Amino acid sequence: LLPIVGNLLKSLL
């Protein structure tokens, strides 16, 4: 989502 690396340093959902 941001710390654990979501998809691109962001939710992107």
4's tokens: 């654990």
Q: Give long-range contacts, CB 8 A cutoff, 24+ apart: 3-11.
A: none
Cα–Cα distance measured from residue 3 to residue 8, given in angstroms and rounded to the nearest whole number: 10
As a three-state string, the secondary structure of the chain is: CCCCCCCCCCCCC
Instruction: Kindly calculate the radius of gyration of the chain based on its CA atoms and give it in whole angstroms.
Output: 5
- Give the separation between CA 4 and CA 13, rounded to whole angstroms: 15
Listed in sequence order, the residues at least 6 apart from 9 whose beta carbon sits closer than 8 Å to its beta carbon are 2
Structure-solving method: NMR
